[PDB]
Amino acid sequence: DACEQAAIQCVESACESLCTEGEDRTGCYMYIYSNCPPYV
């Protein structure tokens, strides 16, 4: 879905608009922190 795809592009700002509140949004930030520059 759009949420997952935003996470994989490393665009945190899009987690808010493309992911549901709660777990989905948290999971988008956690992915970014785990796998995107400059976190890696």
Curated annotation (Swiss-Prot):
Disulfide bonds: 3-19, 10-36, 15-28
One MF term in the entry's GO annotations: pheromone activity
Functional summary from the UniProt entry: Mating ciliate pheromones (or gamones) are diffusible extracellular communication signals that distinguish different intraspecific classes of cells commonly referred to as 'mating types'. They prepare the latter for conjugation by changing their cell surface properties. The membrane-bound form promotes inter-cellular communication and adhesion for mating pair formation and may act as binding site for the secreted form.
Protein name: Mating pheromone Er-1/Er-3
Keyword terms, alphabetized: Cell membrane, Disulfide bond, Membrane, Pheromone, Secreted, Signal
Subunit structure: Homodimer.
Entire-sequence positions represented here: 36 to 75 of 75
One Gene Ontology cellular component annotation held by this UniProt entry: plasma membrane
